[PDB]
Amino acid sequence: DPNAQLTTSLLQTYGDFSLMDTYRNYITGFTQHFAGGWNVTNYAGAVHHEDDIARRIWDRYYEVAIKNLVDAIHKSEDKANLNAALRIHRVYLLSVLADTYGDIPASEAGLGYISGISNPKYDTVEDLYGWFFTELDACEQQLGTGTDHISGDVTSMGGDVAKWKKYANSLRMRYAMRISDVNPSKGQEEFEKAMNHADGYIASAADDAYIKYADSPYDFRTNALGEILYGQDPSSPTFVSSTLFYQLQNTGDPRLYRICRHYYNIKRSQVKPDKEQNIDLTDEVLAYFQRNNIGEEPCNTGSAWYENWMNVADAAEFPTLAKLAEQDANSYDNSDYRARLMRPCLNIDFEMPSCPGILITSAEVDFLLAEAKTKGWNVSGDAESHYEAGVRASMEMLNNYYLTSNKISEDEINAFIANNQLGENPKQTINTQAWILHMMNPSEAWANMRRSDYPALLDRSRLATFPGDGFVYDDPNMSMPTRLRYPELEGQYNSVNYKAAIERMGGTDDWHKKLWWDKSDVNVQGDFNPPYGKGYI
Ligand SMILES: [Mg+2]
Numbered sequence: 051d052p053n054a055q056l057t058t059s060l061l062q063t064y065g066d067f068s069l070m071d072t073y074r075n076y077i078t079g080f081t082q083h084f085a086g087g088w089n090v091t092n093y094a095g096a097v098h099h100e101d102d103i104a105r106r107i108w109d110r111y112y113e114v115a116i117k118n119l120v121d122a123i124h125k126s127e128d129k130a131n132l133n134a135a136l137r138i139h140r141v142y143l144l145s146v147l148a149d150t151y152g153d154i155p156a157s158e159a160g161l162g163y164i165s166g167i168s169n170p171k172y173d174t175v176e177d178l179y180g181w182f183f184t185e186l187d188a189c190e191q192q193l194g195t196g197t198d199h200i201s202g203d204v205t206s207m208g209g210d211v212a213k214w215k216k217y218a219n220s221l222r223m224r225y226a227m228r229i230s231d232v233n234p235s236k237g238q239e240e241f242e243k244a245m246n247h248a249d250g251y252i253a254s255a256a257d258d259a260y261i262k263y264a265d266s267p268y269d270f271r272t273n274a275l276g277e278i279l280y281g282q283d284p285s286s287p288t289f290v291s292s293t294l295f296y297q298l299q300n301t302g303d304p305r306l307y308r309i310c311r312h313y314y315n316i317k318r319s320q321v322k323p324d325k326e327q328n329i330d331l332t333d334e335v336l337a338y339f340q341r342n343n344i345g346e347e348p349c350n351t352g353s354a355w356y357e358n359w360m361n362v363a364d365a366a367e368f369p370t371l372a373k374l375a376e377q378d379a380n381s382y383d384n385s386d387y388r389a390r391l392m393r394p395c396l397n398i399d400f401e402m403p404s405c406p407g408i409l410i411t412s413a414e415v416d417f418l419l420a421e422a423k424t425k426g427w428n429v430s431g432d433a434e435s436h437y438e439a440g441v442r443a444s445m446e447m448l449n450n451y452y453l454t455s456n457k458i459s460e461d462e463i464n465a466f467i468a469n470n471q472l473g474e475n476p477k478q479t480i481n482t483q484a485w486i487l488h489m490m491n492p493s494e495a496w497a498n499m500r501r502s503d504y505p506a507l508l509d510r511s512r513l514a515t516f517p518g519d520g521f522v523y524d525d526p527n528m529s530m531p532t533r534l535r536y537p538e539l540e541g542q543y544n545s546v547n548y549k550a551a552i553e554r555m556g557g558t559d560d561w562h563k564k565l566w567w568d569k570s571d572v573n574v575q576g577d578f579n580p581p582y583g584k585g586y587i
Contacts, residue, residue, distance in 0.1 A: 052125045052132055056136055076103065095351060128198075131196035134196075219251040226241035267403070292580065293507060311396075316382070347582050349393055354519070470483075508578055
């Protein structure tokens with residue numbers, strides 16, 4: 051039943067816990083949104099490849115979503131609306147697969163490959179992006195030529211063909227920007243084609259495209275990215291990196307302590323994050339810093355929370371934990387949980403099972419329009435207006451989709467924008483602000499970081515490594531990987547096509563090899579001397 055297969059494929063995007071290891075261990079580490087958990091320190095922090103972690107995106111999307119999409123596409127030629135929606139989500143997941151690994155099966159990933167009886171070649175990144183524009187144009191026009199109801203839709207589009215059209219056009223704008231370095235003229239042409247389309251694009255948050263997940267306890271119904279970020283036990287929360295912390299603090303970003311909180315979480319629930327026992331001591335922690343003329347030490351990329359050891363405050367320092375330590379010291383005076391309380395952690399609001407699965411937002415389109423303007427493309431309105439719109443929408447998406455309290459006021463948004471105008475390097479400003487936007491969309495975060503080379507990351511090569519703590523540094527090139535390696539079993543079961551793709555790369559499956567649309571290395575910060583804690587060597 052094709053509509054059901056649309057549902058499974060949509061939900062798998064963020065709903066499949068079995069590929070979230072790749073996002074917590076590698077991608078969100080590579081983007082330097084998160085740092086300090088043992089896993090991201092072991093993998094992304096050590097620049098340490100391991101097949102079983104790197105393969106999961108490939109293996110799980112091909113085994114489930116792509117299989118179901120292709121079968122449903124072939125079973126839906128009489129249901130043009132559903133057919134177009136199936137095909138748009140295939141383009142979507144193929145763009146993620148290609149942006150992650152490089153050349154990938156696509157044009158030959160068909161019914162035979164589904165049945166496990168045929169071996170698909172790896173389409174080149176350049177050929178795939180060419181096909182993205184063509185296929186999205188075709189689907190966009192096909193939408194609404196059927197009378198069938200897209201009942202398997204679980205996105206915010208809610209089966210509305212007009213909303214799927216704007217989604218397809220917005221993805222065209224995303225891909226057109228992606229190729230704007232390697233093929234400037236095609237990027238310009240494809241962008242303005244979509245931007246000027248009669249059916250429009252995602253112009254306000256009312257038209258945001260996202261998958262809707264269920265508010266049920268921790269089969270793709272719940273957002274598994276939040277699940278793995280919440281950790282599978284209270285000793286493994288997701289710690290916010292110093293890169294993100296310092297981007298927020300140093301720009302006066304009201305998002306600083308919406309994204310960052312301090313938790314003592316020993317009795318927290320494991321079926322659904324609870325305010326009761328994810329004890330939010332943020333204000334009391336900050337009051338403690340201020341009393342002692344000290345401050346935050348957000349974990350550096352490459353380091354774990356127990357490295358670059360920060361002094362641990364006694365329970366007495368925090369009145370809420372103090373009175374609970376005095377009631378029950380085994381629970382609330384545990385020194386390990388006090389230690390992790392010291393570091394900024396991701397708000398559990400971002401870790402709820404019902405968190406959305408972002409596909410593309412009006413805030414991103416705003417930033418695309420801003421950069422399109424700074425490139426001279428024929429866009430209406432100045433770069434600053436689009437830029438400001440995108441900052442305001444990124445702000446507002448947290449109010450609308452995530453925050454359960456402490457919403458960001460219109461005063462704060464207006465204040466922040468005034469202090470962070472475009473400046474002398476708009477491309478850097480635009481893409482740094484998009485990178486915050488993309489926190490919970492790690493694949494777009496990593497792709498757009500790679501293409502735009504902003505934000506300037508912390509130079510991993512000048513941050514500490516901790517081999518004495520069991521981590522393995524088996525790669526001399528410690529700069530951020532620009533892709534993931536192919537699943538190693540492809541070398542056996544798709545051996546000839548695997549060899550070919552590797553040969554096109556230069557003869558080895560090299561995760562320091564830049565993809566076709568990635569023309570330069572991501573920028574890095576020249577200096578990192580934080581007021582508290584450790585910086586560059
Ligand atoms: Mg690059």
